[PDB]
Amino acid sequence: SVSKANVPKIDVSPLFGDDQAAKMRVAQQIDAASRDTGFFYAVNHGINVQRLSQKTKEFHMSITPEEKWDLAIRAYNKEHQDQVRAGYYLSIPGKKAVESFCYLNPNFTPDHPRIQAKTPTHEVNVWPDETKHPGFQDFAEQYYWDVFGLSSALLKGYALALGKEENFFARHFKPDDTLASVVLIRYPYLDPYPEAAIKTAADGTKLSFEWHEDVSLITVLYQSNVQNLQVETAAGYQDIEADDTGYLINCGSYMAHLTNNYYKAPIDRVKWVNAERQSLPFFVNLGYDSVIDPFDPREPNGKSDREPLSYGDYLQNGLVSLINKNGQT
Numbered sequence: 001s002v003s004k005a006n007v008p009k010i011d012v013s014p015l016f017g018d019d020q021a022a023k024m025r026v027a028q029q030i031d032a033a034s035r036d037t038g039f040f041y042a043v044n045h046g047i048n049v050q051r052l053s054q055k056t057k058e059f060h061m062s063i064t065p066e067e068k069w070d071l072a073i074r075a076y077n078k079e080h081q082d083q084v085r086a087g088y089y090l091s092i093p094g095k096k097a098v099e100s101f102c103y104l105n106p107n108f109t110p111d112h113p114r115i116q117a118k119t120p121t122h123e124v125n126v127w128p129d130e131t132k133h134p135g136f137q138d139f140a141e142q143y144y145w146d147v148f149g150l151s152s153a154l155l156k157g158y159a160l161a162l163g164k165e166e167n168f169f170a171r172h173f174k175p176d177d178t179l180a181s182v183v184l185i186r187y188p189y190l191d192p193y194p195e196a197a198i199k200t201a202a203d204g205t206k207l208s209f210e211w212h213e214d215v216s217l218i219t220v221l222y223q224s225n226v227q228n229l230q231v232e233t234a235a236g237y238q239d240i241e242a243d244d245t246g247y248l249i250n251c252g253s254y255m256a257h258l259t260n261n262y263y264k265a266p267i268d269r270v271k272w273v274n275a276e277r278q279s280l281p282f283f284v285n286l287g288y289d290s291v292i293d294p295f296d297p298r299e300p301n302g303k304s305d306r307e308p309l310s311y312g313d314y315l316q317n318g319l320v321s322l323i324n325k326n327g328q329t
């Protein structure tokens, strides 16, 4: 038998405003959620998630095999050695059901000094032909900035929750250098669904994606209305109920590092469900050289002996390790 995780709905709208006491009351709710199962739903977030879902579906359902090869990351197309992050992640019929499209900061252009310097984890986004996908790039770039704005407000809540001034995290989250990414993931309905695309957990549960901690400061996730996620607790995995009107929020392992595990990065996994659905995460990443000094809210002096960790190294190592452990997506 499988229990259900407590995932509170938090009205985050005060984080956009100037009522400081109301922001502290949101912060308390973020603190409680982060110390419990590690997840909450952000509601009253101001993003049109119906349009996000509609535009994403229109793209997933109209892109052709030829277009997928043209946009494919290096793991699927040897001609594209510069694409380790951004581009198309192909399905393999009979073997791999999931497919996705990842894009990064639109400000990463050939003019950007991190592209000029060839710094790892920075790439120029690739896009389908505008005439074949009218409005897609424009929608996707505006969405990046819409969810950036929500994430900046959520970061104010996390800072206040930890006893800091509201810009403690957000000051490192900037349009000119953020390594944040959007991934538009399609999980298809398939009949028959090939068993090769289904993994079996130690506890016997059929999975599409195994346990992991997120590589992020925080993760800001929209999913369509098909229950699939489970969070690990000491008493076992618990189902996270779906909510296609909100954003599911959690801390990633960079947050766990810098708080000395006070806000743990929750471990979750994806149950196998034979249903057409969408999983659209925004990974809130900082800049390549961002360093946040670790602290320990449990200690009166807040002292932590954990070493400061540069975000770029954290991200490069984390994304490689996640592929090694959980497979190329």
Ligand SMILES: CC(C)[C@@H](NC(=O)[C@H](CS)NC(=O)CCC[C@H](N)C(=O)O)C(=O)O
Binding pocket: 084, 085, 086, 102, 180, 181, 183, 185, 209, 212, 214, 221, 270, 279, 281, 283, 319, 322, 329
């Ligand atoms: C659990 C969800 C967040 C979603 N999973 C995911 O988003 C998956 C698996 S944890 N995420 C990743 O592998 C990291 C993607 C990083 C991205 N290419 C980038 O360059 O920044 C799903 O539905 O599988």
Ligand SMILES: [Fe+3]
Binding pocket: 212, 213, 214, 266, 267, 268, 269
């Ligand atoms: Fe996760």
